[PDB]
């Protein structure tokens, strides 16, 4: 049996990712693959316990689901994560954010790296996320929205609340960026809400500022977000304040899935 030889990003693609801080590959996974992933997302939402947020999200699924454990090692994903981070990689965080059709809430503006630095002791922004589109992403279903190029200022300040981790993945974020600081960013750089079909992957930088609106449409916007971190860039588990299902502690380099008879 045969896995297709690993495909990496073109030099132009890499350049676009570096410039903008994000990049879309369309139709990475086919419909049958996507349906498998949706079914498993549904299992995880139904049985996740304390790993579910209210359903707003579920976290850490690759540690509990075999299908998700295999996904993060996929030859469609792992080679590009390696290429972009220029290292072996492991999964820092895994989450599925079901931005539900009628009543799907905001994600206020944030840089993931701000959270991961302060909550988990990640030392540099040498990480990225791959967001798999379980549904078509349009203007109307609350797309992920970015300031392009906004990753190249490093972190930028954000006020904190809670002496806990509970408010890290709510509508009200622990480290959001204020109206003024965003107005600045937006006035200079733009806003972009990249779009795509079911099965696409949206790659984005740990430090790019991003957000998403409420879901207007009658349509869902299920995303599977896999955060790859550089093994060299492993988080300092002695600054770590969160469970494994939010911030991994096993830094074993991932290997790609090979084709087997089962």
Annotated binding site: 95, 97, 99, 110, 112, 168, 210, 212, 221
Residue 210 partner contact from ligand [O], ligand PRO, a second copy, none using kind-dependent CB cut-offs of 5 to 8 Å = ligand [O]
Q: How far apart are CA 35 and CA 210, in angstroms?
A: 27
Q: Residue 166: is it exposed, middle or buried by C-beta count within 10 angstroms (0-12/13-18/19+)?
A: exposed
Q: How far apart are CA 165 and CA 155, in angstroms?
A: 19
Q: How far apart are CA 247 and CA 262, in angstroms?
A: 31
Q: How far is the CB of 35 from ligand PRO (least distance, A)?
A: 27
8 or 172, CB closer to ligand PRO? Answer: 172
Total binding residues for ligand [O] by CB under 6 A?
3
- Residue sitting closest to ligand [O] (CB): 112
Bridge-partner residues for 93, per DSSP?
Answer: 227
For the beta sheet containing 107-110, the strands, ordered from the edge strand earlier in sequence to the opposite edge, are: 107-110, 210-212, 144-146
**Binding positions for a second copy, 65-104, rule CB under 8 A:** 79, 82-83, 86-88
* x/- track of binding to ligand [O] for residues 207-226 (CB under 6 A): ---x----------------
Does 253 bind a second copy (CB under 8 A)? Our answer is yes
Residue 85's nearest CA partner among 129, 29, 27, 26 is: 129
Give contact residues for a second copy (rule: CB under 8 A).
2-3, 5-8, 10-11, 79, 82-83, 86-88, 231-232, 253, 255-256, 258-259
């Amino acid at each position: 049996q045969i896995m297709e030889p690993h495909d990496t990003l073109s030099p132009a693609q890499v350049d676009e990712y570096r410039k903008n801080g994000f990049l879309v590959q369309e139709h990475v996974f086919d419909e049958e693959e996507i349906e498998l992933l949706r079914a498993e997302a549904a299992q995880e939402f139904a049985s996740g316990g304390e790993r579910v947020t209210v359903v707003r999200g579920v976290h850490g699924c690759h540690l509990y689901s075999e299908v998700f454990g295999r996904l993060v090692r996929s030859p469609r994903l792992l080679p590009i994560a390696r290429q972009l981070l220029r290292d072996d990689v492991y999964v820092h965080q895994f989450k599925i954010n079901a931005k539900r059709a009628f009543k799907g809430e905001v994600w206020e503006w944030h840089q993931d790296y701000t959270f991961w630095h302060h909550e988990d002791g990640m030392p540099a922004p040498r990480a990225l996320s791959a967001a798999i589109f379980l549904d078509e992403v349009t203007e109307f279903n609350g797309p992920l929205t970015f300031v392009p190029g906004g990753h190249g200022s490093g972190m930028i300040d954000a006020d904190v609340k809670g002496e806990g981790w509970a408010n890290t993945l709510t509508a009200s974020l622990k480290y959001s960026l204020d109206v003024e600081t965003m107005r600045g960013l937006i006035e200079r750089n733009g806003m972009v809400a990249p779009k795509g079909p079911r099965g696409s992957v949206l790659w984005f930088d740990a430090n790019i500022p991003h957000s998403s609106v409420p879901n207007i449409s009658p349509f869902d916007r299920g995303l599977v977000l896999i955060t790859y971190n550089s093994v060299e860039n492993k988080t300092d588990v002695t600054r770590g304040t969160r469970p494994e299902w939010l911030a991994a502690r096993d830094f074993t380099p991932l290997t790609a899935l090979q084709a087997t008879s089962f």
